[PDB]
Paper text:
Glycoprotein 130 (gp130) is a signaling receptor shared by interleukin-6 (IL-6) family cytokines (or gp130 family cytokines), including IL-6, ciliary neurotrophic factor (CNTF), cardiotrophin-like cytokine factor 1 (CLCF1), leukemia inhibitory factor (LIF), oncostatin M (OSM), cardiotrophin-1 (CT-1), IL-11, IL-27, IL-35, and IL-39 (1). These cytokines share a canonical four-helix bundle structure in which four major helices (termed helices A to D) are linked by three loops (termed AB, BC, and CD loops), as well as three conserved receptor binding epitopes (termed sites 1 to 3). IL-6 and IL-11 signal through gp130 homodimerization, while other cytokines require another “tall” signaling receptor, such as LIF receptor (LIFR) or IL-27 receptor subunit alpha (IL-27Rα), which forms a heterodimer with gp130 for signal transduction.
CLCF1 was also found to interact with CNTFRα and signal via the gp130-LIFR heterodimer analogous to CNTF, and cytokine receptor–like factor 1 (CRLF1) was shown to chaperone the secretion of CLCF1 (6). The bottom centers of LIFR and gp130 juxtamembrane domains are positioned ~22 Å apart, comparable to that seen in the CNTF complex. CNTFRαF172 also serves as the anchor point of the CNTFRα-CLCF1 interface by engaging T193, W196, R197, and K200 of CLCF1. Multiple electrostatic interactions are observed between positively charged CLCF1 residues (R48, R95, and K200) and negatively charged CNTFRα residues (D234, D284, and E286). Key gp130 residues engaging CNTF maintain their roles in the CLCF1 complex, with F191 engaging K42, D45, L46, and Y49 of CLCF1 helix A; D215 forming a hydrogen bond with CLCF1K42 at the center of the interface; and W164 capturing the middle portion of CLCF1 helix C. Similarly, site 2b (1325 Å2) has a larger buried surface area than site 2a (944 Å2) in the CLCF1 complex and greatly increases interactions at the composite site 2, which may explain why CNTFRα is indispensable for CLCF1 signaling. Like F152 and K155 of CNTF, the two conserved CLCF1 residues F178 and K181 also serve as key anchor points engaging LIFR residues (S310, N313, V315, I322, G324, and V326), consistent with previous mutagenesis studies. Notably, 72% of CLCF1 residues contributing to the packing of this interface are nonpolar, which is much higher than the percentage of nonpolar CNTF residues at the CNTF-LIFR interface (44%). We found that the CLCF1 complex and IL-27 complex appear to be more unstable than the other signaling complexes we characterized since the particles imaged in the cryo-EM experiments for both samples showed a very low percentage of full complex (~2%).
Residue numbers in the entry:
A (entry chain D): 34 to 211
B (entry chain A): 124 to 515
C (entry chain C): 107 to 305
D (entry chain B): 132 to 385, 390 to 533
């Protein structure tokens, strides 16, 4: 099929995952924390500093050509998937864990599809060895409020990363085909 | 016995719900026929399945249905005489999506436009993933056959749709099913039949009218019995509220009535008159007719000749010849003749250019019918002509 | 008259570029006032050099994208009878609202008597719509129905109306909106077109 | 003359920062007084420059002119890391054979303890679980000023302390959800907060009945009472305790209902199943007797067929797994006619190993569209077993 239908399927899957993540984020904010759903509750982020950020400039976003963006997106996807698995092991609720496992396996399928697309475009970089230090990330001894704040910041960063990845895929579609 | 691997490689996918993949059973094996189904995403293998002992035709495929992924499934045959697999098939679950029929269908009247009828519905949760094409079917509540709307008009996803060029005052029912835009995929079920009426669309047809020449006796003023038939439902386009007539008399003089009932009693004199009617719908007045009554000393004025009547197929038929100059309107009446039984005068309207037209009623056989045909001219009618004819 | 609490609601017309917004008091004052606006954005400083067409617009310029930092602004008024201030916070994703599109024209087709073609243009103030996919919202309705029909469209500057009447004209009002960030904008100015009729 | 007691001296003072309990001990100089005069010892607690919160008096008597060391404890309403605390002791001797004036002793020198900051925790306590409605006060130690404090959308009033410390007074706390309620202290540029849990003690487990499928293991099922509102790592833990053998089984935390496992020891026949409920708030127990021979419940026999020689008619033979070589069975057999009559009868069998059984019938009938259905039980009077699949394998007629 080539890069024609594959990129369209990836974009549709990213849109579906964005909708599912929006629904899951609404549910998680309504469930976890009385001062979290109705109030603003924007505290300074001093607890989460290990996960990769998604703060890039416009010029450095337009300078890349379909390779560094893909590598960084793969690394961020792996890290966020590990963190989501940790959050899943942390949470304890039947329907919530079911929806979380559904989202996790859908994100894993999307990552596999992205890896297949990368291997299909003819780039001699199939799969570089990622991490292996945070490959498990066991839950350390911390407070419950700190863990809740870390989970909230992780969800926000994952939403921002999904939006940035959708915009970057749109930019790649604009730069590649026409 | 040989394993008799399954075939036909055909099954559907549901919108997030549990999906079962169907396969053919085959022939009578009866040797621990318990198949298994596999799944593969080329990066991760899902858990295998097990064919049901009751109906080993379909089982679970994937608990969490994911779209836009390459799923490889194959049904393996396992028995005592070795093992064998079947043909492999690669399909996309997004192509075999079976959506839900749109619910809450409702039609409304916007601004009394009798030409366009809008319809709205709610699209399912799959509208954000696949493009849906629509095929609306409508029909009359009386008819049993359906009418299909051209599919090329609703080939794209739309929230509302308006059907144009409909019939006035006839109830329609609607049901809609959707599928993928391209066409590769299974259809959906039929939605709930939604009712709905059309607009008013006042009738642009002049109703019938006929008077009487009853022999009044009060030395002058004549009591004429104005009788007109009831307008048919399709020819009326709405509930008949009331009838309005108009009487013509000497210069600068005219009267009219608005009686609810379909019967009027207006006096006459020794001068020429002209009576017109006009039915009023909910929006306004309809078209009128024409009729003159010079019953003072009028002559036959070339009455119609050559009157023959023979049913000859399952119903009575009337035929005559064309008069000398021309004819404007045609009208004929009939009733049942028997031993001391009053018969009512039932009639109908016919065009002038037509000379043969079968009657429409509920007459029976083995009875004497006196069909009387009376012509209509510009200066009064002609003398009546009666003829007897049986049915069977 | 002492000053009251002003209204502060900002809007971003261009997502890649900066944003601009104004501030006004609900009750007018017969004497001129002096305003001073400053931006923090966490721990930083913004100048937003002022050169607008209408006053009270400093045209804050963006520097980082997807920073996940809630932008906050604080205004301050002054008067001979009192001095109030207002601090309002928001995000860089909710205030995104483009400008209504211009040059919206329609044209009938000579073959089909119930089909119309609508072709509009992208707003000039908005950046390249090919890089940032937009979402248009077309509303076609006759001049006497007064009942708008909502139809959502995908990326594209063309639409084929298959629901148009054959003996009445229509009006088309289209809006502009990004793919997944922001809300809907205002509609177009006007539109007029008649279907084809054989004679 | 007026006799005054000697000024007491504090021997050693300490406290536990985990449970916030003060420890105080002192040795009275009773060796210089041979008489058993009643001594009235009173203790006073004072914080943040002698507030004099609560007084307490302890009456005792010396031991025959000997110095006896004794320990006294007290639980404060606030954590020790909230403010400094001083302790003072004094006594009042009361002699019976003295008519003079007895005046109280002089206060001992001041003795205080200071919590040295060792961790970055600024809010106390840390994950404390108490009974619902109890009064608990929080403390937020810091070096800067704070704005306000609240639990959720409440904005409760604040109380200042001596040095840059704020405390809140909460009364009659409400119930908590699956997640513990969070309290926070709004600062100028930061925010500090902890989590507190408020649940109910474990209710008494009702409907304690134990049945057995085979005579090899025991299973028990019941249902809890009121919810404890503490799910996760602080959930309840049930444990069974045996009378004679002393065996015990631990419950595996994973629901609506659950069943445990208890391996049977031979030649015991008597057990007093006691369920112990562990919880940091309360404990409950339940003692219910059971009979391993009177609470037997057989299983459904599977893999049985019908076949016989040209002699007398069919002889059923079912396969029931387990160990029942000691106790017999009372499996009642029922045969049904062609949807007209269903006869009922009962037969007896001996103990067989893990194999099929032997049941004989007599004076049957031709085909006549007969069916079969089995249902077994035990010699003891208890519940029956589940039904099996119907079979109609009949022999030839005529
Ligand atoms: C669309 O029409 C359906 C049936 O015509 C209606 O469904 C009703 O929905 C409400 C609320 O969900 C229920 O309380 C009623 O029992 C439903 N049935 C009826 C006959 O009222 C409703 O008007 C519309 N449905 C939705 C989901 O909006
Ligand atoms: C700033 O505006 C506020 C409100 O817009 C003013 O507050 C008013 O103060 C007077 C006198 O105390 C009250 O009678 C009014 O009810 C207040 N208005 C409210 C509460 O809406 C205030 O005076 C203004 N000036 C300053 C310097 O704050
Ligand atoms: C509180 O306890 C401290 C102990 O840290 C006392 O400080 C001692 O004071 C005496 C004389 O006043 C000195 O001889 C010691 O060296 C001090 N100990 C130190 C500095 O560790 C203090 O007096 C007690 N009382 C008050 C009111 O602070
Ligand atoms: C804590 O407050 C609640 C109410 O907010 C109290 O519950 C009330 O208790 C009284 C009797 O004690 C009842 O008559 C009321 O109907 C209860 N009201 C509600 C809403 O439940 C509760 O008793 C208080 N607890 C303590 C320890 O004071
Ligand atoms: C029944 O089993 C219990 C198992 O602990 C035996 O032990 C008694 O347990 C109860 C618990 O409430 C204690 O109050 C008794 O003091 C225990 N008794 C002994 C001897 O330790 C109990 O003895 C058994 N009952 C009989 C009649 O033997
Ligand atoms: C089996 O094949 C036939 C075509 O001969 C057709 O009905 C369909 O493709 C398959 N049907 C089922 C039920 O699998
Ligand atoms: C089903 O058939 C297979 C075929 O060999 C057999 O191994 C198995 O025991 C049968 N029963 C079940 C429950 O799988
Ligand atoms: C009187 O007129 C009304 C409409 O104006 C209509 O119901 C009908 O023609 C008449 N009423 C009855 C009861 O016949
Ligand atoms: C009947 O006559 C009245 C005046 O007498 C007039 O207002 C009304 O319009 C007339 N109706 C019709 C149908 O002409
Ligand atoms: C703005 O300017 C005014 C005077 O021009 C000054 O009083 C004020 O401190 C400045 N800053 C703010 C935030 O108002
Ligand atoms: C248990 O039951 C058996 C037989 O039913 C009986 O012999 C025995 O005494 C019972 N045990 C007790 C403690 O009653």
């Amino acid at each position: 099929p080539g890069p024609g239908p594959s990129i369209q399927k990836t974009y549709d899957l990213t849109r579906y995952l964005e909708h599912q993540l929006r629904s899951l984020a609404g549910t998680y904010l309504n469930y976890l924390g009385p001062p979290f759903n109705e109030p603003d509750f924007n505290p300074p982020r001093l607890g989460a500093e290990t996960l990769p950020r998604a703060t890039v400039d416009l010029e450095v976003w337009r300078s890349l050509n379909d390779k560094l963006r893909l590598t960084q997106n793969y690394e961020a996807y792996s890290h966020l998937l590990c963190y989501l698995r940790g959050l899943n092991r942390q949470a304890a609720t039947a329907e919530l864990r079911r929806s979380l496992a559904h989202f996790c396996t859908s994100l894993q399928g999307l990552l596999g599809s992205i890896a297949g697309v990368m291997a299909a475009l003819g780039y001699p970089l199939p799969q570089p060895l990622p991490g292996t230090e945070p490959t498990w990330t066991p839950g350390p001894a911390h407070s419950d409020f700190l863990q809740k704040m870390d989970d909230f910041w992780l969800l926000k960063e994952l939403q921002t990363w999904l939006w940035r990845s959708a915009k970057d895929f749109n930019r790649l579609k604009k730069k590649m085909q026409p | 016995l040989p394993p008799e691997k399954p075939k036909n490689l055909s099954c559907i996918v549901n919108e997030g719900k549990k999906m079962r993949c169907e396969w053919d059973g085959g022939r009578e094996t009866h040797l621990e026929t318990n198949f298994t189904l596999k799944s593969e995403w080329a990066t991760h293998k899902f858990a295998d399945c097990k064919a049901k002992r009751d109906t080993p035709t379909s089982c679970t495929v994937d608990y969490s249905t994911v779209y836009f992924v390459n799923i490889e499934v194959w049904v393996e045959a396992e028995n005592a005489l070795g093992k064998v697999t079947s043909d492999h098939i690669n399909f996309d679950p997004v192509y075999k999506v079976k959506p839900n029929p749109p619910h809450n269908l409702s039609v409304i009247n916007s601004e009394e436009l009798s030409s366009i009828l809008k319809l709205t519905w709610t699209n399912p949760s799959i509208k954000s993933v696949i493009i849906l094409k629509y095929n609306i079917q409508y029909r009359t509540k009386d008819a049993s056959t359906w009418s299909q709307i051209p599919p090329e008009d609703t080939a794209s996803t739309r929230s509302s749709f308006t059907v144009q060029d409909l019939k006035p005052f006839t109830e329609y029912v609607f049901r809609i099913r959707c599928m993928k835009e391209d066409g590769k995929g299974y259809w959906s079920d039929w939605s709930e039949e939604a009712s709905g009426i059309t607009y008013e669309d006042r009738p642009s047809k002049a109703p019938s009218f006929w008077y009487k020449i009853d022999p009044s006796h009060t030395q002058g003023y004549r009591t004429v019995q104005l009788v007109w038939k009831t307008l048919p439902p399709f020819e009326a386009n709405g509930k008949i509220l009331d009838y309005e007539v108009t009487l013509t008399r000497w210069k600068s003089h005219l009267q009219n009535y608005t009686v609810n009932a379909t019967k009027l009693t207006v006096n006459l004199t020794n001068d020429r008159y002209l009576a017109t009617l006009t039915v009023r719908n909910l929006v306004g007045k309809s078209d009128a007719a024409v009729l003159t009554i010079p019953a003072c000393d009028f002559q036959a004025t070339h009455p119609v000749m050559d009157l023959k009547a023979f049913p000859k197929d399952n119903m009575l038929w009337v035929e005559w010849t064309t008069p000398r100059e021309s004819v404007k309107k045609y009208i004929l009446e009939w009733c049942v003749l028997s031993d001391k039984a009053p018969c009512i005068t039932d009639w109908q309207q016919e065009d002038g250019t037509v000379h043969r037209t079968y009657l429409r009623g509920n007459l029976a056989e083995s009875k004497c019918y006196l069909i009387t045909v009376t012509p209509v001219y510009a200066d009064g009618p002609g003398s009546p002509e009666s003829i007897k004819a049986y049915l069977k | 008259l002492p000053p009251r609490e002003p209204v502060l609601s900002c809007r971003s017309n261009t997502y890649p570029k900066g944003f601009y917004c104004s501030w006004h008091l609900p009750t007018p004052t017969y004497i001129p006032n002096t305003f001073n606006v400053t931006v923090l954005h966490g721990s930083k400083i913004m100048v937003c050099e002022k050169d607008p067409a209408l006053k009270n617009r400093c045209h804050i310029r963006y520097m980082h994208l997807f920073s996940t930092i809630k932008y906050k602004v604080s205004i301050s008024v002054s008067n001979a009878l009192g001095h109030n201030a207002t601090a309002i916070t928001f995000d860089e994703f909710t205030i995104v609202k483009p400008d209504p599109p211009e040059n919206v024209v329609a044209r009938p087709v000579p073959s089909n008597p119930r089909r119309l073609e609508v072709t509009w243009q992208t707003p000039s103030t908005w950046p390249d719509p090919e890089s940032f996919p937009l979402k248009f919202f077309l509303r076609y309705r006759p001049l006497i129905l007064d009942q708008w029909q909502h139809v959502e469209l995908s990326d594209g500057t063309a639409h084929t109306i298959t629901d148009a009447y054959a003996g009445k004209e229509y009006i088309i009002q289209v809006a502009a909106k990004d793919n997944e960030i922001g809300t809907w904008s205002d509609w177009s100015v006007a539109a007029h077109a008649t279907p084809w009729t054989e004679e | 003359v007026s006799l005054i007691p000697d000024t007491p001296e504090i021997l050693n003072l300490s406290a536990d920062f985990s449970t916030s309990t003060l420890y105080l001990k002192w040795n009275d100089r009773g060796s210089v007084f041979p008489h058993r005069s009643n001594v009235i010892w009173e203790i006073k607690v004072l914080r943040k420059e002698s507030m004099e919160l609560v007084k307490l008096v302890t009456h005792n008597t010396t031991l025959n002119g000997k110095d006896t060391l004794h320990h006294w404890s007290w639980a404060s309403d606030m954590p020790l890391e909230c403010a400094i605390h001083f302790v003072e002791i004094r006594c009042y001797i009361d002699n019976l054979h003295f008519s003079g004036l007895e005046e109280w002793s002089d206060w001992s020198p001041v003795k205080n303890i200071s919590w040295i900051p060792d961790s970055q925790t600024k809010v106390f306590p840390q994950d404390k679980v108490i009974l619902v409605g109890s009064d608990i006060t929080f403390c937020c130690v810091s070096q800067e000023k704070v704005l306000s404090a609240l639990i959720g959308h409440t904005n409760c009033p604040l109380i200042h302390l001596d040095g840059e410390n704020v405390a809140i007074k909460i009364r009659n706390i409400s119930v908590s959800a699956s997640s513990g309620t969070n309290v926070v202290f709004t600062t100028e540029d930061n925010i500090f907060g902890t989590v507190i849990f408020a649940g109910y003690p474990p209710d008494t487990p009702q409907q304690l009945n134990c049945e057995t499928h085979d005579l090899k293991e025991i299973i028990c099922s019941w249902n809890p009472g009121r919810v404890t509102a503490l799910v996760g790592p602080r959930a309840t833990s049930y444990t069974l305790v045996e009378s004679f053998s002393g065996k015990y089984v631990r419950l595996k935390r994973a629901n609506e209902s659950y069943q445990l496992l208890f391996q049977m020891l031979p030649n015991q026949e008597i057990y007093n199943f006691t369920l112990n409920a562990h919880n940091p708030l309360g404990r409950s127990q339940s003692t219910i007797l059971v009979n391993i021979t009177e609470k037997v419940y057989p299983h459904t026999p599977t893999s049985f067929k019908v076949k016989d020689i040209n002699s007398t008619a069919v002889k059923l033979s079912w396969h029931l797994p387990g160990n029942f070589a000691k106790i017999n069975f009372l499996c009642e057999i029922e045969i049904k006619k062609s949807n007209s009559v269903q006869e009922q009868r009962n037969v007896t069998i001996k103990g067989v190993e893990n194999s099929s059984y032997l049941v004989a019938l007599d004076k049957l009938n031709p085909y006549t569209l007969y069916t079969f259905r089995i249902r077994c039980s035990t010699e003891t009077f208890w519940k029956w077993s589940k039904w099996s699949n119907k079979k109609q394998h009949l022999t030839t007629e005529a």
